[PDB]
């Protein structure tokens, strides 16, 4: 079972942020050996925390780490560009295995914050006719990019047969990202209306589409 | 420096075994690790190795499945994959547990291997099958290429000609293991019913070449 870090943070340059790790008293509040790891696109991660407290030779000391209870916490002074990127924090447990936060993407500002363009397509007519139908849910132009997205059949949840992309990179210097919905033609006749609703950076935006 | 190999793509119940070559340090005096990194999500531990081999610690997931294992006398970590599912898709690299005097495991991963890939799915190669996406004074429209198998396929529209306002998505993987990627062009609403809007989908592995007329 991960430990539980926030899906993100963000910053702009100069400015001090922090991120949480917050385990079981099994294996975060039960031991001193918290570490914590940086990872750049397509690179492989590197310490920047151990012991809880401790540098590795060669680590800025803008990088500091604390424990209080079950949550330990990561904290980087002065965000410079080069800080950013995803980190993850690994555990020792009661049982001498080893355990990962679930991870933190960390965007250290370029622009200002910008909100996503979302576009809903109802299931093409092509498809329906081939015993298919799928929705597309496009969202473009927003930053950080980090997006929950969600689904609603009528005002009721979905969470059956969902897939949505990683947020990609536009030549725009903003994201883009996309959550498609299967269902039977069935399904998509019998309900009154289909929802998207992506929620970023606290907001919540929302398109709908009906037979 | 450490090296991953022994990957590749493989059906879900196949086996595969991967191998990390070390060097550059004493092997059989360290602890080491296996982890791996599903695309597009978190890192993920998998199995530990005590440096001589007399004890081994697996992860939930992965138990009891993959079974670590290593060779003092080769300097090599070894993983060993059995009834392989589609979860275990995802990068495996081979990380070194620091360590030394009063070894002593510190508890922090200082060496990574630059990873090796495992792609476990049931898809065949396959052509895509293409849909339009209809629009509804600023028009969106675009295709739906669903069910493509593997990556890439490149889509133009109009041939090349109109390359203004087209935004091509990332595919998503679907739990069947086919690919499916959207298109789209932002058009002048005037346009529509005067203009012709052609997307052209091209898919090198398979050789299929498809093209679909949109329209309101």
Redesign the interface.
């Given at each position: 079972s991960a430990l539980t870090q926030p899906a993100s943070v963000s910053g702009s340059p100069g400015q001090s942020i922090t991120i949480s790790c917050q385990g079981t008293s099994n294996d975060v509040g039960g031991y001193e050996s918290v570490s914590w790891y940086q990872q750049h696109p397509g690179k492989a991660p590197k310490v920047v925390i151990y012991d809880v407290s401790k540098r590795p030779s060669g680590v800025s000391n803008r990088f500091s780490g604390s424990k209080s209870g079950n949550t330990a916490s990561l904290t980087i002074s002065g965000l410079q560009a080069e800080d950013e990127g995803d980190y993850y924090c690994k555990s020792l447990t009661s049982t001498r295995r080893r355990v990962f936060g679930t991870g933190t993407k960390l965007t250290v500002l370029g622009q200002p914050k910008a909100a996503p363009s979302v576009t809903l397509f109802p299931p093409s007519s092509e498809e329906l006719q081939a015993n298919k139908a799928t929705l597309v849910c496009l969202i473009s132009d927003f930053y950080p990019g980090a997006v929950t997205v969600a689904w609603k059949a009528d005002s009721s949840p979905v969470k059956a047969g969902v897939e949505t992309t990683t947020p990609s990179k536009q030549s725009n210097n903003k994201y883009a990202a996309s959550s498609y919905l299967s269902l039977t033609p069935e399904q998509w006749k019998s309900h009154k209306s289909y929802s998207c609703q992506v929620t970023h950076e606290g907001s919540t935006v929302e398109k709908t589409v009906a037979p | 420096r450490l090296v991953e190999s022994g990957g590749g793509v493989v059906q879900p119940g196949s086996s595969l075994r991967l191998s990390c070559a070390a060097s550059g340090f004493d092997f059989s005096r360290q602890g080491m690790?296996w982890?791996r990194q599903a695309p597009?999500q978190?890192?993920?531990?998998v199995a530990?190795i005590k440096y001589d081999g007399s004890e081994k610690?697996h992860?939930d997931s992965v138990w009891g499945r993959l079974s670590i294992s290593r060779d003092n006398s080769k300097d090599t970590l070894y993983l060993q994959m059995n009834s392989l599912r589609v979860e275990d898709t995802a990068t495996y690299?081979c990380v070194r547990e620091?360590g030394g005097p009063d070894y002593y495991n510190?508890?922090?991963?200082?060496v990574?291997?630059?990873?090796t890939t495992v792609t476990v799915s049931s898809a065949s190669t396959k052509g895509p099958?293409v849909?339009?996406?209809?629009p509804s004074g600023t028009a969106?429209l675009?295709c739906?290429v669903?069910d493509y198998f593997p990556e890439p396929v490149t889509v133009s529209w109009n041939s090349g000609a109109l390359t203004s306002g087209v935004?091509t998505?990332?595919?998503?993987?679907?739990?069947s293991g086919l690919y499916?990627?959207?298109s789209?062009v932002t058009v002048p609403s005037s346009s529509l019913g005067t203009q012709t809007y052609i997307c052209n989908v091209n898919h090198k592995p398979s050789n299929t070449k498809v093209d679909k007329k949109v329209e309101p």
């Open positions: - | 690790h982890v597009g978190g890192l993920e531990w530990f610690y992860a690299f620091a510190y508890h922090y991963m200082d990574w291997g630059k990873g099958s849909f339009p996406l209809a969106a675009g739906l669903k935004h998505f990332p595919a998503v993987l679907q739990s499916s990627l959207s789209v």
